Amino acid sequence: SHMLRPVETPTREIKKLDGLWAFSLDRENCGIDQRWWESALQESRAIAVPGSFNDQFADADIRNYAGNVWYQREVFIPKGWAGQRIVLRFDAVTHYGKVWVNNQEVMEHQGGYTPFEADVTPYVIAGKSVRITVCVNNELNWQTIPPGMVITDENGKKKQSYFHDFFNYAGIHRSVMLYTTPNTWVDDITVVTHVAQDCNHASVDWQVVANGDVSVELRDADQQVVATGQGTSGTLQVVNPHLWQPGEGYLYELCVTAKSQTECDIYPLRVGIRSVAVKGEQFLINHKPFYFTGFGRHEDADLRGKGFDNVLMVHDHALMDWIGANSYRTSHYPYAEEMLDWADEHGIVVIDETAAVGFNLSLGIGFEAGNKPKELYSEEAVNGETQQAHLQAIKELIARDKNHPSVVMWSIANEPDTRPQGAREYFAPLAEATRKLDPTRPITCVNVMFCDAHTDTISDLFDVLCLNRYYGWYVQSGDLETAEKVLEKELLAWQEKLHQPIIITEYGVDTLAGLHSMYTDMWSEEYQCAWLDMYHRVFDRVSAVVGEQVWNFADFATSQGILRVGGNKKGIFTRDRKPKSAAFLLQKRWTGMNFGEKPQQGG
């Protein structure tokens, strides 16, 4: 369906992200049989909502819970919403959630990171109080988008196992909200920006009205009409542009309007006039070679898990600003739009990624049998339905983010095993579909290291080569000398094989804050510096390398294991955002370069 971020013009939001809701588990899964959405959640406890439910209660049982949980709260409908289209919207409900407005089911959704909404007008009376019950499921299987395997022992007690690194946090991670629109209302927009060697060109507009005549107009930062248009679906505006630039991110405003014989609708969409294209080994932005620096990030912090927070966001962007990072990838799932809005406004360049991580049965900490399917691409494991769900995930992401200028490329997935035979058969259609859905952005699929230049089967189907490389860590452990020979050899292989622009989208080493060593070995702050330093020497020798995104700006939680010391420690910053010495290393290299430009080969 159509998706537009709610703003407040003839429209209005009652946030209802207002924190406190009632909360209780369903350990027996009799919540639907007993119709819990019909009565006050019995035996419930307070919970904060935008957030993960796992960490809020310092309870291991609640944290490791698999299955259904229930949220609930009563809210008032603004009396002034008398005759309006009243919509209930969840910016995210991790993995699955079903919604009842007082014994009337309105929604159902299967993906944890994108919004779903429903017209609740016929089920809400303006000025009264309603009972909103959400049932949330945090289970993964071979058709869910991060694939997964829910294991159930002889006792019936379920247990979630997955193939990605980060912890499987669940719950309502983002805002829920009631919002208003007139019965004639803009409900879908699509803007393509074009540019021709930086003096003028056009923005195609494509508008889906909920039954109205649409007019449109483009406004400066100082709010003046620089262009104007009429008609529905089709338009091309022409300009003398202030281009959206990685540095500043100048934004115009396209004000879309929907007119009945009786009702108006005004929707302002921030627009960034910029071109994103690949030419050979280069990633051109506004027809200029751009060099990515920054992080693979995560949505993760103490207490709130993947729950959104404005302070966290403000702080992290201050940090990424200080350190000199010009980019990042929404590591492994669509991030909260607030992030993309920030990126739009501050000129931050983003690699937007689906939640499609886990395709791989070969990332294992060995020697626990842990029978996984023997065929990755097979009816048991990654099958036709999976491909659909995957396709669906791509659709829902693009539908949401197609208009963000900050997004400079789509990432279909992260580290699938591309060796097995069905790999190319599974991904080819997804690469073609993605291009259909958005023709205006280069496409990528993040590559795991054991599917190297000689064994990978998929990378030619994409535009930019995004590599996850750990030479000197998981392999050639603690050996910088040989890791460097391999890294550079593998990069040159990829260069000559595909002649695409290479971005190292992951490189980093677990590092204990405060672990110092004269011998500069693996888990020490000094090693993290020596490692990163070595990678950088290599990158500056390889012309096709067009980007470097360190594996993790900050330590994050993972599933328990012998590889993970209370989580992943590849953070440049700790989880409470305190900088390891590598932070200062990067700030020198990144602030030291000419902005958005690859280093001549040496200082």
Ligand X SMILES: Cc1ccc2[nH]c(=O)c(CN(CCO)C(=O)Nc3ccccc3F)cc2c1
Percent helix, strand and coil across the chain, each rounded to 5? 20, 30, 50
The binding track of 298-337 with respect to a second copy, each residue x by CB under 8 A or -, is ----xxx--x-xxxxxxx--xx--x---------------
From residue 127 to residue 166, the character string flagging contacts with a second copy as x (rule: CB under 8 A) and all else as - is --x-------------------------------------
SS3 244: coil
- 204/192 Cα distance (integer angstroms): 5
Q: What is the DSSP code (8-state) at residue 289?
A: B
CA distance 262 to 596: 50
Partner whose binding site includes residue 300, from ligand X, a second copy, none (CB under 5 to 8 Å by kind): none
C-alpha span between 50 and 187 (Å, rounded):
25
**590 marked as part of a ligand binding site:** no
Which of positions 441-500 make contact with ligand X (CB under 6 A)? 448-450, 468, 470, 474-475
In whole angstroms, the minimum distance from the beta carbon of 305 to a second copy comes to: 9
Tell me how crowded residue 364 is: count the other CB atoms within 10 A of its CB. Answer: 12
Cβ atoms of 6 and 16 within 8 Å: the answer is no
Q: Please choose, out of 20-28, 105-113, 358-366, 431-439, the segment that lies near ligand X by the rule CB under 6 A.
A: 358-366
Residue 364's binding partner, choosing from ligand X, a second copy, none, with beta-carbon cut-off 5 to 8 A by kind? ligand X
* Smallest separation, CB 365 to ligand X (Å): 4
**Distance between CA atoms of 74 and 150, rounded to whole angstroms?**
33
**CA gyration radius for the chain?**
24
Residue nearer to a second copy on the CB measure, 56 or 94: 56
User: What does 313 bind: ligand X, a second copy, none (CB cut-off 5 to 8 Å by kind)?
Assistant: a second copy
* Degrees, nearest 5: CA angle 573-343-437: 115
Min CB(51)–ligand X separation in Å: 24
Which of these, 165, 110, 107, 95, lies nearest to 134 by C-alpha position? 107
Among 2, 79, 157, 279, binds a second copy (CB under 8 A): 79
Q: Which 32-71 residues touch a second copy, going by CB under 8 A? A: 46-49, 51, 55-59
Give the footprint of ligand X on residues 399-428 (CB under 6 A).
415
Site string for ligand X, 124-163 (x = CB under 6 A): ----------------------------------------
Q: Cα separation of 593 and 600, whole Å?
A: 9
CB atoms within 10 A of CB 289: 16
Convert residues 265-294 into a mask of x (bound to ligand X by CB under 6 A) and - (unbound). ------------------------------
Kind plus residue range of the DSSP H or E element containing 118: strand 116-119
Positive or negative, the Cα torsion across 461, 462, 463, 468? negative
Binds ligand X by CB under 6 A, chosen from 226, 363, 391, 433: 363
CB of 315 vs ligand X, minimal distance in Å: 26
By rule CB under 8 A, what count of residues binds a second copy? 44
240 appears as a binding residue in the annotation: no
Burial of 527 (0-12, 13-18, 19+ CB in 10 A): buried
Scanning 53-120, the segments in alpha helix (DSSP H) are 60-63
User: How far is 155 from 440, CA to CA, in rounded Å?
Assistant: 52
Write down the residue that tokens 């291991």 correspond to. 60
Cβ closer to ligand X: 344 or 415? 415
Q: Smallest distance, Å, CB 177 to a second copy?
A: 10
For the beta carbon of residue 444, count every other beta carbon within 10 angstroms. Answer: 27
Please report where in the chains the tokens 């971020």 appear, as a residue.
5
* DSSP class of 146: S
Active-site residue 380, yes or no?
Answer: no
Kindly name the residue from 217, 396, 506, 525 that is annotated as catalytic. Answer: 506
Tell me the residue nearest to ligand X as measured from the CB: 364
Nearest distance from residue 149's CB to ligand X, in Å? 13
Number of residues that bind ligand X (CB under 6 A): 14
Judged by CB under 6 A, which stretch of 103-111, 359-367, 571-579, 582-590 contacts ligand X? 359-367
Clarify whether 506 is annotated catalytic.
yes
CB of 381 to a second copy, least distance (A): 36
Angle at CA 550, nearest 5°, toward 547 and 552? 145
User: Would you count residue 206 as binding ligand X (CB under 6 A)?
Assistant: no
Q: 254 or 483, CB closer to ligand X?
A: 483
Rounded to the nearest 5°, which phi and psi values hold at 483?
-60, -35
Question: Does residue 561 touch ligand X according to CB under 6 A?
Answer: yes
- 280's contact among ligand X, a second copy, none, with CB below 5 to 8 A by partner kind, is none
Catalytic residue among 217, 353, 396, 415: 415
∠ at Cα 329 (418, 304), nearest 5°? Answer: 110
Q: How far apart are CA 512 and CA 522, in angstroms?
A: 10
Q: Is 303 in the site for ligand X (CB under 6 A)?
A: no
In the complex with a second copy, the residue whose CB is nearer, 320 or 502, is: 320
- Asked whether residue 141 is marked as a ligand-binding residue, the answer is no
Instruction: CB nearer to a second copy: give 51 or 420.
Output: 51
Considering CB distances under 5 to 8 angstroms, the limit depending on partner class, which of ligand X, a second copy, none binds residue 474?
A: ligand X
Exposure b/e, 221-242, CB count within 10 A at least 16 = b = eeeeebbebeebeebebebebe
List binding-site positions: 165, 414, 468, 474, 506, 551, 570
Contact positions vs ligand X (CB under 6 A): 165, 363-365, 415, 448-450, 468, 470, 474-475, 561, 563
Q: Active-site residues: which are they?
A: 415, 506
